[PDB]
Amino acid sequence: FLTSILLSSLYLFNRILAWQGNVKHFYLFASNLLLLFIVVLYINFNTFSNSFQFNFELFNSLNPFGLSNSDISNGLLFGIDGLSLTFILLTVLLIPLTLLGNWYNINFNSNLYYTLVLAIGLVILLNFWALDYISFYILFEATLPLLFILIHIYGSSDSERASFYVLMFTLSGSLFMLLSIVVISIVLNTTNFINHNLFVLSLDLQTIIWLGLFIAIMVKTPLFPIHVWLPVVHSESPLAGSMILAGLILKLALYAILRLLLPLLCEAQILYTPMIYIISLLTIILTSLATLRQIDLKVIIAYSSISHMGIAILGVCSNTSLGIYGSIVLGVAHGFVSPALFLIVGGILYDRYHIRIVNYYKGLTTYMPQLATYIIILSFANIGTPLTGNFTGEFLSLQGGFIRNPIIGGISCISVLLAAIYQLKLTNKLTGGISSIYMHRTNDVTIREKFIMNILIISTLIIGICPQIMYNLLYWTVNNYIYII
Amino acid sequence: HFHPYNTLGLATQSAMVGLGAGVVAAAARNSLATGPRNILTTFSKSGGVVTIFTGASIAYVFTYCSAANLRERKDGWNHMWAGAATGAVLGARTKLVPAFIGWTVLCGAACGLFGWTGARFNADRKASLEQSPKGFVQEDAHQTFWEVVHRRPLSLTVEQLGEGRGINAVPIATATEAP
Amino acid sequence: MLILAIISLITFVSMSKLSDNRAIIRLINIYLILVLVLDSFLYLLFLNNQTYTVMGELLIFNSFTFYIDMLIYFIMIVISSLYGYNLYNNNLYKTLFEPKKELIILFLINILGALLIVHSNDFITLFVAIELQSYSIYLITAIYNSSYKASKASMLYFFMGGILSILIAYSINTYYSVLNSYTLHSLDSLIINTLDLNLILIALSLGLLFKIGIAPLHKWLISIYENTPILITIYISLIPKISILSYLVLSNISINSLVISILAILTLLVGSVGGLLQIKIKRLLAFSGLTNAGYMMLLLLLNNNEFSYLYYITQYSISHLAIFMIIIFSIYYINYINNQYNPIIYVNQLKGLIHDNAYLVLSMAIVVFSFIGIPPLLGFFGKLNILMSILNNGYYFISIVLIVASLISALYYLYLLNVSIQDKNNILINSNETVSSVLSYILSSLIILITFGFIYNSLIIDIFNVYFN
Amino acid sequence: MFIGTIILVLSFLGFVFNRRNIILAFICLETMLLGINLILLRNSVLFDDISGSLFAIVIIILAGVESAIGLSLLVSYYRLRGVINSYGI
Amino acid sequence: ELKPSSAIQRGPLNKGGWDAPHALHNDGAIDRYAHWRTFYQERFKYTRATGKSTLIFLVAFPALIGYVAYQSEGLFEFAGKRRGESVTTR
Amino acid sequence: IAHHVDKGSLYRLGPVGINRLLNKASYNVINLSSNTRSSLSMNSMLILITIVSLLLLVLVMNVNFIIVIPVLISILYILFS
Ligand SMILES: CCCCCCCCCCC(CCCCCCCCCC)(CO[C@H]1O[C@@H](CO)[C@H](O[C@@H]2O[C@@H](CO)[C@H](O)[C@@H](O)[C@@H]2O)[C@@H](O)[C@@H]1O)CO[C@H]1O[C@@H](CO)[C@H](O[C@@H]2O[C@@H](CO)[C@H](O)[C@@H](O)[C@@H]2O)[C@@H](O)[C@H]1O
Ligand SMILES: CCCCC/C=C/C/C=C/CCCCCCCC(=O)O[C@H](COC(=O)CCCCCCCCCCCCCCC)COP(=O)(O)OCC[N+](C)(C)C
């Protein structure tokens, strides 16, 4: 049955490629089918169980091609809790929006581009299903060649250096992640997201293991020593690469610090949270300050994403239920509101004028009133202006970080000010003034751009008016990672 | 414990081995070259090689043994300080201050990462996972390095971590109970 | 059955004309295929790591060495397909990829000498087989004698192989002068404690290892690999590597050696940063072999390293084979053919390869990302299982040097990609003649192995568990 | 062991610092093989066995075959360049 | 005599589609300024102002808030407190 | 911060300084055998140097391991610079 579904489906695909040159209609169709499938899975999800509900094993020895019903299991496990399914819902409603986001600008070799974008989306979808450390790690770096090819073939003038940096920095942190994963797999002889809180390592073996995982998380939720590939890989990517990156990869490393570190490095983690607070306060302040002198326009939103991830990390590392919940709300709400900003700068503003320097853009209200409406609504939604989901995440993460250490909570609370300075400094320059003498007047915002914007604004407003709507997934996982004896 | 180092004589021995290594490398550069070269161009057209060898040898072993005698314990920090001194000597041939500082800090970081892994190219035998007790403890004992248990002693948690943040010598539940 | 082929073959080749050489190679190709298919059931001999010694403790046959001979036969089937099949039917590729009359003779004699090293138990079998394969590489290098570079390379390889063979002979007779013995089966766990065999056994391993291309003495081999023609160098890069390393991994005489660790650190360093600013594709391609031989010098320090070794061997062999075959295929699309023996030299000559045969670039990208060690591909599990043996056994500085070396080596691997996915002005639209069905199927098989070979990891570990334990 | 060691060492250093022609390199290679023979046959006599004599009679034949192979290699080096340089190949 | 084949038919590459008319007048001064700022690092050099900034923001400020963060870990509880009650522990 | 720290000194420890370090180290190890007109004398003297030098190193190295670390640091310095 299940094989006949697939070679029906492969024949479906071959015939519509034979009769239609493009793929994008079928990729949109498969994306929305994947949406409906994940929401049917959410209907059948048991919230009253802490355990992993929809389990499957791939590449077992008794059945290498397909599912596994065995006494012995050495393949790759997959399955979800509420924590996984939160990010799966966030991922699956963003994949059609990034396929839709480049519906007209990619002209030359379209089918390659849409295949790469859908492939990256599928890899990141399967990242949240994984249940081994090696099964997490394999999909965790399957993205990188596709990102390299996507950034190198499509982009601006400088897409060679950006493609190199997205392979280089990510690979360089993630190799030390592999070091710690190998040490875990030779001590425990098991890599598993199920059993791994039962095993207790020695304190100085834990403090050796924890370093390599935290270095990779410092590279990928980019904290201050290496926060540095991120503005260039944003500022020189195509549109769906930027959107998928800043909506999903950074939140994937935010998911990895919960899933991989907090269960079997508890006694290490307590010894190291002051160092994490040094690094996260120091990547809030110094990056939020370095945004004030920026000549380019996508680079400002890249540095914004740094500062918001720095707020979220002191939520997960807070040893508080409030901080864990607020970091999850911040990750999901940021994954909504930031790709809308990258669409504002890269889609409505780079398709029309093909330059990204700030000095050309002035007085956009008088020819584009509803674009300007979007720009100011998204600016305030990005700041931490409430009823938005960004303030719920920032408020609960700042509260957890105040519980764990009140002085670094006191100096971390100024991120409310620092995040608003550069954002409103950009927004009043874009909206205010006489219309630019460099810009000739173009079209106002189109139906598909307004469609993407309206979806990404409603989904922040619903979380911002009621953050309880996703507590039913998280109330286990908010208690799961707390170590208060 | 530890016993104090012979900074005097280890530094003399290091100056001897650096002098010999400079002799050998200057002879090697003499033999592997072009042009009019004779027997006493070994120390004129050497490129300053004996200075490199002896200066690095004196600097590293002096700073290593001095830092281990000043700190009165032996770990990888002494390799950090001695590599910083070696990077100072190797960076002074660069007559430039920022490159000098770069040589100092980066050679000290590389040598400290070297000395923290054991300061050995090869392996240690009994420290290996292959030649150590591993797996579960089979009954309750002092859990060694490379070993796994199911539950840890809470007294070890209080002594190693602290009595502060969320961590206490008795859980919050039974500290607050009705009788 | 190699002996049969040599005995039959030189008889048959002396009577053929030069018009028949290519067809002769086709015959031998199919012959070796039916030695794989019809005769591999001998794996049933080696249950539970049962080991035989043959010819009076002269040869040793276990399942490790059975896997190595299967690997060498598979690679010889690929290489002999590359000689015996035309790329295109042009008057171009006939004057470029042309076999000599005595090429397949020297191929099979070299495969014989390479098998009698891995299957070897005593030191004179080791010696005689080392010189058999060394004279064969001398003559395979010198057989395209209408070439200045290949003649100079054969002379250089003669002298540098002669020194390092006399060093092996000195180490063997030096071992004999302290032990009236030839076996390392003589050693048996107690003699090593009460006898200083360190200097002997390490000098033996070093004289064996400098022929691979380990780091102080690497440049002469890089020059031989750049000077030989493009079909010869895919064979002489692979076969001494896998034969000599499969000897030195099976015999554990340099366990926890300080000298081998120094030279492994130095090999990983000088191969990674050595091939960075290099503009010739075989140079670029040979420093990759230098680093990937460093990763084996690491396993020489190990006890019980047979999984990590054999996995990373067939990994490197498939990846090596495929990346040379892809740049064989890119010769059709370059705007400039020099140098009849070595028609593509500079790596910028493959610059617009995505706009002419984009699936060749898909091929190329797959094998280059497997060289880097990207997790969906087969090179990742090789590097992973090497790390699982390095960290298990206490080599902590070696681990970080391995990681930094792989990160530095990723630069010049991706430089191939960076060149090939680029804009080109005059692109192909319509070409009349086709690439060989027989020979492009081999490249596609080698890719499908690399991409979808992670599927069978657990099957392979279970079959490993039974036949080696 | 003295005569074989010193002929091997002096033969090796005469090979290494050869800058004058190419056939000095060949004959220094052959004298290296002679020194290896000397050391081994002395050890066979001192240990009262043939097995060093076995390896010595095999390495005689291998030295001969390497001389034949390598001198044909020099002839093919000479085919296209009717001169052999003094500094080397 | 080594020329790639007679049967190639190679021709020029086009991107394809519509040439959008120019919506933006380039500024040479703004483009040169922004190209100068984007690639600022390849002309960056160490000076005294650079050294002041590097030591102040990379070593001095991390050491300062490091001292503050390690001195004050288990100091403060403010959860349920009253008048005359300590809010620190040590 | 945006010029002297983020684009200035975090790139000297990052992609801008590593490119220059690797450029210099690769140039030095490629010019390691640039000198002589001869291939053969060059490589056969190179074989002599190492089987001398390694033996000298282990002669140092079983006496004391501290006095051989700066020897190897200096060998890396003259090899890569
Ligand atoms: C980018 C990230 C970089 C990360 C680098 C971290 C490397 C840090 C290494 C830590 C580590 C290897 C663990 C690595 C495991 C996986 C590592 C993953 C890959 C890492 C690549 C090497 O530990 C080394 O630490 C050095 C200093 O830290 C020492 O230096 C030297 O100091 C002076 C010598 O006397 C010299 O005088 C000076 O000359 C040297 O300088 C070394 O001697 C020591 O071996 C620890 O292993 C060891 O720890 C000890 C103490 O528990 C274990 O103790 C045993 O077990 C308990 C009961 O049985 C008892 O309690 C304990 O008493 C007992 O003895 C051992 O079983 C052993 O296992
Ligand atoms: C009719 C068949 C004729 C015989 C065909 C034999 C061809 C030899 C080819 C060698 C290179 C191609 C890779 C093939 C790997 C085979 C794995 C294997 O089975 O090797 C075993 C494990 O290997 C190990 O430890 C480690 C081996 C690592 C393998 C890593 C590569 C993984 C992906 C490629 C292999 C899977 C491809 C399967 C595609 C269906 C060890 O030796 P065995 O005594 O059990 O062999 C028995 C194989 N027989 C039954 C076909 C003779």
Curated annotation (Swiss-Prot), chain D:
Its EC number is 7.1.1.2. Keywords: Electron transport, Membrane, Mitochondrion, NAD, Respiratory chain, Translocase, Transmembrane, Transmembrane helix, Transport, Ubiquinone. It is found in: Mitochondrion membrane. One of its GO terms (molecular function) is NADH dehydrogenase (ubiquinone) activity. It holds the Pfam family Oxidored_q2. It catalyses: a ubiquinone + NADH + 5 H(+)(in) = a ubiquinol + NAD(+) + 4 H(+)(out). Core subunit of the mitochondrial membrane respiratory chain NADH dehydrogenase (Complex I) that is believed to belong to the minimal assembly required for catalysis. Complex I functions in the transfer of electrons from NADH to the respiratory chain. The immediate electron acceptor for the enzyme is believed to be ubiquinone. PANTHER family: NADH-UBIQUINONE OXIDOREDUCTASE CHAIN 4L, NADH-UBIQUINONE OXIDOREDUCTASE SUBUNIT ND4L. This is NADH-ubiquinone oxidoreductase chain 4L. It comes from Yarrowia lipolytica (strain CLIB 122 / E 150) (Yeast). The lineage of its organism: Eukaryota, Fungi, Dikarya, Ascomycota, Saccharomycotina. The gene is ND4L.
